[PDB]
Amino acid sequence: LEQMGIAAKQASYKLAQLSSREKNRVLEKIADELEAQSEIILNANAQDVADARANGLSEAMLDRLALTPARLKGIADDVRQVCNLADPVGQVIDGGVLDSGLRLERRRVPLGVIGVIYEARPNVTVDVASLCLKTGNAVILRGGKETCRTNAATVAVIQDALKSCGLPAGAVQAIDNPDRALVSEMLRMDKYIDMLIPRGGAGLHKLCREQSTIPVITGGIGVCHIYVDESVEIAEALKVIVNAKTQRPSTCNTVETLLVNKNIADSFLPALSKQMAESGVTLHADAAALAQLQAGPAKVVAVKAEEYDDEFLSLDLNVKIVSDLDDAIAHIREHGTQHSDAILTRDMRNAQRFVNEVDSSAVYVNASTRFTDGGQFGLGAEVAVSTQKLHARGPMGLEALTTYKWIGIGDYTIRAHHHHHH
Amino acid sequence: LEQMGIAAKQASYKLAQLSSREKNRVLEKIADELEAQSEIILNANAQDVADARANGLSEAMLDRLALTPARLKGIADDVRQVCNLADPVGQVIDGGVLDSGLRLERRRVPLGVIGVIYEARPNVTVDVASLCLKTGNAVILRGGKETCRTNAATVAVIQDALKSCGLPAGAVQAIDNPDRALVSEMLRMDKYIDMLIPRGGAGLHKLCREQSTIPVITGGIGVCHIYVDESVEIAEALKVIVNAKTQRPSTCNTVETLLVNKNIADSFLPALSKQMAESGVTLHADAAALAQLQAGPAKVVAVKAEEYDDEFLSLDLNVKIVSDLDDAIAHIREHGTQHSDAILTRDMRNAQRFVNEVDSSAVYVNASTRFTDGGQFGLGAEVAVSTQKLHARGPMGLEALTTYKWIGIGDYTIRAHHHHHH
Amino acid sequence: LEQMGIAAKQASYKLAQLSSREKNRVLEKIADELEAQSEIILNANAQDVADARANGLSEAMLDRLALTPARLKGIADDVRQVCNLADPVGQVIDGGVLDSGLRLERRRVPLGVIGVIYEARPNVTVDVASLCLKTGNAVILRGGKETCRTNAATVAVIQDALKSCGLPAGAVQAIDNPDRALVSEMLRMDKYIDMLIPRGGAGLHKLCREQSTIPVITGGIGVCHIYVDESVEIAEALKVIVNAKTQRPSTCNTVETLLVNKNIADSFLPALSKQMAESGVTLHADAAALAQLQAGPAKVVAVKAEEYDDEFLSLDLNVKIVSDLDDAIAHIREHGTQHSDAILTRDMRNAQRFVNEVDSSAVYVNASTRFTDGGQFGLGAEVAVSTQKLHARGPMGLEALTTYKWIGIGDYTIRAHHHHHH
Amino acid sequence: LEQMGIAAKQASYKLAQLSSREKNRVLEKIADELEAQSEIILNANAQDVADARANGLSEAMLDRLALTPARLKGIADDVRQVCNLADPVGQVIDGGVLDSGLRLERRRVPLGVIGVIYEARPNVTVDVASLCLKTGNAVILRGGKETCRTNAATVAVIQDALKSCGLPAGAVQAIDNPDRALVSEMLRMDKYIDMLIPRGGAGLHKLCREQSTIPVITGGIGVCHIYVDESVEIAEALKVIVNAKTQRPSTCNTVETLLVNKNIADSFLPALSKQMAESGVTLHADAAALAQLQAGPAKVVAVKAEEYDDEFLSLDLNVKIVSDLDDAIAHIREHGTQHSDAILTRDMRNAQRFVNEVDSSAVYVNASTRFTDGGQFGLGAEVAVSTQKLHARGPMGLEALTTYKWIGIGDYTIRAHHHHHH
Ligand SMILES: NC(=O)c1ccc[n+]([C@@H]2O[C@H](COP(=O)([O-])OP(=O)(O)OC[C@H]3O[C@@H](n4cnc5c(N)ncnc54)[C@H](OP(=O)(O)O)[C@@H]3O)[C@@H](O)[C@H]2O)c1
Ligand SMILES: NC(=O)c1ccc[n+]([C@@H]2O[C@H](COP(=O)([O-])OP(=O)(O)OC[C@H]3O[C@@H](n4cnc5c(N)ncnc54)[C@H](OP(=O)(O)O)[C@@H]3O)[C@@H](O)[C@H]2O)c1
Ligand SMILES: NC(=O)c1ccc[n+]([C@@H]2O[C@H](COP(=O)([O-])OP(=O)(O)OC[C@H]3O[C@@H](n4cnc5c(N)ncnc54)[C@H](OP(=O)(O)O)[C@@H]3O)[C@@H](O)[C@H]2O)c1
Ligand SMILES: NC(=O)c1ccc[n+]([C@@H]2O[C@H](COP(=O)([O-])OP(=O)(O)OC[C@H]3O[C@@H](n4cnc5c(N)ncnc54)[C@H](OP(=O)(O)O)[C@@H]3O)[C@@H](O)[C@H]2O)c1
The C-alpha torsion from A35 through A37 and A38 to A41, rounded to 10°, is: -130
- Shared domain for D136 and D249, answered yes or no, is no
CA-to-CA separations, C240 to C228, C260, C338, C366, D299, in angstroms, rounded: 11, 14, 20, 8, 78
First CA to last CA across chain A, in angstroms? 56
On the CB side of C397, CA atoms within 13 Å amount to 19
Q: Report if residue B416 sits inside a domain.
A: no
Q: Can you tell me the distance from the alpha carbon of C280 to that of C130, in angstroms, rounded to the nearest whole number?
A: 38
- Cα dihedral C267, C273, C276, C277 sign: negative
Q: Tell me the three state secondary structure of residue A44.
A: helix
Contact B352 C411 (CB under 8 A): yes
| Buried b or exposed e, range C44-80, using 16+ CB within 10 angstroms | bbeebbeebeeeebeebbeebbebeeeebebbbbbbb
Measured in angstroms, the resolution is 3.0
Pairing of strands A103-107, A92-97: antiparallel
Percent helix, strand, coil in chain B, to 5, is 45, 20, 35
CA distance D312 to D348: 32
Instruction: Please identify, by atom number, the ligand 2 atom nearest to the C-alpha of residue B220.
Output: 1
Strand partners, C299: none
CB of D367 closer than 8 Å to CB of D342: yes
Q: What is the 3-state secondary structure (H, E, C) of C87-117?
A: CCCCCEEEEEECCCCCEEEEEEEECCEEEEE
- Cα–Cα distance measured from residue B316 to residue B249, given in angstroms and rounded to the nearest whole number: 9
How far apart (Å, rounded) are the C-alpha atoms in residues A339 and A221?
A: 8
Residues A229 and A208 in one domain: no
Task: Tell me how crowded residue D78 is: count the other CB atoms within 10 A of its CB.
Answer: 21
- Asked whether B348 and D351 are in contact (CB, 8 A), the reply is yes
Q: Note whether residue A422 is domain-resident.
A: no
Cα B13 to Cα A1: distance, rounded to the nearest angstrom: 45
Q: How many residues does chain B have?
A: 422
Measure the N-to-C terminal CA separation of chain C; round to a whole number of Å: 56
Q: C214-224: buried (b, 16+ CB within 10 Å) or exposed (e) per residue?
A: bbbbbbbbbbb
The distance of B365 to chain D (nearest Cα, Å) reads 11
* Inter-helix orientation angle D69-83/D38-53, to 10°: 130
H helices within A54-201, ranges in order? 59-65, 69-84, 122-135, 148-165, 181-187
Name the closest ligand to CA A177. 1
Identify which of B194, B215, B362 has the shortest CB distance to residue A408.
B362
| Pair (B181, B249) in one structural domain | no
**Closest protein CA for atom 44 of ligand 3:** C201
Helix (H, G, I), strand (E, B) or coil at D148: coil
Are C324 and D368 a contacting pair, CB within 8 Å? Answer: no
Range of the domain at D329: 224-371
CA A351 from centroid of its chain's CA atoms? 26
Q: How many Å apart are CA A264 and CA A237, to the nearest integer?
A: 12
- Identify whether the C-beta of residue B120 lies closer than 8 Å to the C-beta of residue B65: yes
The one-letter amino acid code at D241 reads I
Q: For A348, which of C21, C86, C348 is closest by C-beta distance?
A: C348
Pocket test residue of D119, D149, D179, D396 for ligand 4, highest count of atoms within 8 A of CB: D119
Same domain for A159 and A37? yes
Q: Which helix (H) or strand (E) holds B395?
A: strand B394-395
Which of these, A186, A208, A187, A190, lies nearest to A199 by C-alpha position? Answer: A208
Q: Are residues A251 and A330 in the same domain?
A: yes
d(CA A415, CA B236): 14
Which residue in A has a C-alpha nearest to residue B214's C-alpha? A209
Residues C9 and C128 in one domain: yes
Q: Is residue B47 situated within a structural domain?
A: yes
Residue A216 is given by DSSP the state B
Determine the Cα–Cα distance for residues B323 and B254; give it in Å rounded to an integer: 24
Count of the separate structural domains present in chain B: 2
Closest chain A CA to residue C84: A422
Identify whether C314 is part of a domain: yes
- How many residues make up chain A in this entry? 422
Q: Could you tell me the CA-to-CA distances from D289 to B144, D260, D283 in Å, in that order?
A: 73, 9, 10
Closest CA to D130 of D391, D375, D388: D375
- φ, ψ of residue A317 to 5 degrees: the values are -150, 155
D185 plus D65 within the same structural domain: yes
The residues on A that touch C, with CB distances below 8 Å, are 19-21, 24-25, 27-28, 83-84, 86-87, 89-92, 94-97, 99, 101, 103, 105, 107, 346-348, 351, 366, 420, 422
Give the sheet arrangement for strand A195-198, strand by strand: A172-174, A138-142, A113-117, A195-198
Contact (CB, 8 A) for A304 and A335: no
Amino acid identity of residue A205, one-letter, is: H
Distance, CA of B390 to chain centre: 15
Are the C-beta atoms of A156 and A181 separated by less than 8 Å? Answer: no
Inter-residue contact C254 to C370 (CB < 8 Å): yes
Count H helices, E strands: chain D? Answer: 14, 18
- SS3 assignment, position B371: helix
CA distance to D231, D267, D269, D285, D343, per residue, from D264 (Å):
7, 6, 8, 16, 14
What count of other Cβ atoms lies within 10 Å of the Cβ of residue D395?
Answer: 25
C200 lines ligand 3 (CB under 6 A): yes
Do D97 and B19 count as a contact with CB atoms less than 8 A apart? yes
Q: How many CB atoms lie within 10 A of CB D140?
A: 25
For ligand 4, is residue D144 a contact (CB within 6 Å)?
yes
Instruction: Confirm whether D360 is domain-assigned.
Output: yes
Neighbours, chain B (3 or more CB pairs < 8 A): A, C, D
- C119 Cβ inside 6 Å of ligand 3: yes
Interface probe for C, chosen from B19, B77, B352 (most Cβ of C below 10 Å), is B352
CA B352 and chain centroid, separation = 26
Contact B341, B222 (CB under 8 A): no
Angle subtended by helix axes C38-53 and C20-36, to nearest 10: 60
In this structure, the strands spanning D113-117 and D195-198 are parallel
Which segments of A317-372 does DSSP mark as H helices, in order? 325-335, 348-357
Question: What's the CATH number where A269 sits?
Answer: 3.40.309.10
Same domain for B42 and B102: yes
In a domain, D108, yes or no: yes
- Does a structural domain hold residue A415? no
C-alpha triplet D376, D380, D381: angle, nearest 5°: 80
Residues C93 and C182 in one domain: yes
Question: How far is residue C370 CA from its own chain's centroid?
Answer: 12
DSSP D300-319: EEE--SSGGGS---SSEEEE
Task: Give the N- to C-terminal CA distance of chain D in Å, as an integer.
Answer: 56
C-beta of B144 in contact with ligand 2 (< 6 A) = yes
How many Å apart are CA D258 and CA D241, to the nearest integer?
9
| CA distance, residue B246 to nearest chain C CA (Å) | 26
CA angle B122, B123, B127 (to 5 degrees): 135
Q: CA D378, D384, D388: angle at the middle one, nearest 5? A: 105
| Chain A, nearest residue to C231 by Cα | A347
Chain B residues with CB-CB distance to D under 8 A?
19-21, 24-25, 27-28, 83-84, 86-87, 89-92, 94-97, 99, 101, 103, 105, 346-348, 351, 366, 422
Pairing of strands A402-403, A109-110: antiparallel
Nearest to A195 among B360, B361, B390 (CB): B390
CA distance D132 to D382: 11
Nearest CA to ligand 4 atom 1: D219
Q: Could you tell me if A107 and A92 are in contact, meaning their C-beta atoms sit under 8 angstroms apart?
A: yes
Please, which residues bridge with residue C385 across strands?
Answer: C395
Helices and strands, number each (H, E), in chain A: 14, 18
3-state secondary structure chain C: CHHHHHHHHHHHHHHHCCCHHHHHHHHHHHHHHHHHCHHHHHHHHHHHHHHHHCCCCCHHHHHHHCCCHHHHHHHHHHHHHHHHCCCCCCCEEEEEECCCCCEEEEEEEECCEEEEECCCCHHHHHHHHHHHHHHCCEEEEECCCCCCHHHHHHHHHHHHHHHHHCCCCCCEEECCCCCHHHHHHHHCCCCCCCEEEECCCHHHHHHHHHCCCCCECCCCCCCEEEEECCCCCHHHHHHHHHHHHHCCCCCCCCEEEEEEECCCHHHHHHHHHHHHHHHCCEEEECHHHHHHHHCCCCCEEECCHHHHHCCCCCCEEEEEEECCHHHHHHHHHHHCCCCCEEEECCCHHHHHHHHHHCCCCEEEEEECHHHCCCCCCCCCCCCCEECCCCCCCEECCCHHHEEEEEEEECCCCCCCCCCCCC
Question: In this structure, are A31 and A175 located in the same domain?
Answer: yes
Q: Are strands B385-386 and C282-285 parallel, antiparallel or unpaired?
A: unpaired
A202 CA from centroid of ligand 1 (Å): 8
B53 and B86 inside one domain: yes
Beta strands per DSSP E along B270-359: 282-285, 300-302, 316-322, 341-344
H-state helical runs in A211-324: 234-246, 265-279, 287-294
Amino acid sitting at position C410: G
How far apart are alpha carbons B120 and B150 in whole angstroms? 10
Collapse the DSSP code of B380 into the 3-class scheme (helix H, G, I; strand E, B; otherwise coil) and give the result: coil
The single-letter code of the amino acid at D186 is M
Q: Are residues D140 and D207 in the same domain?
A: yes
Say yes or no: CB of residue C375 within 6 Å of ligand 3.
no
Experimental method: cryo-EM
Query: Alpha-carbon distance D420 to B330, whole Å?
Result: 56
Residue C345 and residue C231 in contact, taking contact as beta carbons nearer than 8 Å: yes
Classify strands D113-117 and D138-142 as parallel, antiparallel or unpaired: parallel
Q: Check CB contact under 8 Å for A405 and B393.
A: yes
User: Helix and strand tally (H, E) in chain B?
Assistant: 14, 16
Closest CA to C128 of C156, C148, C93, C154: C154
Domain boundary among B371, B387, B416: B371
Which of A346, A351, A422 is closest, CB to CB, to C28? A422
Domain assignment present for residue A416? The answer is: no
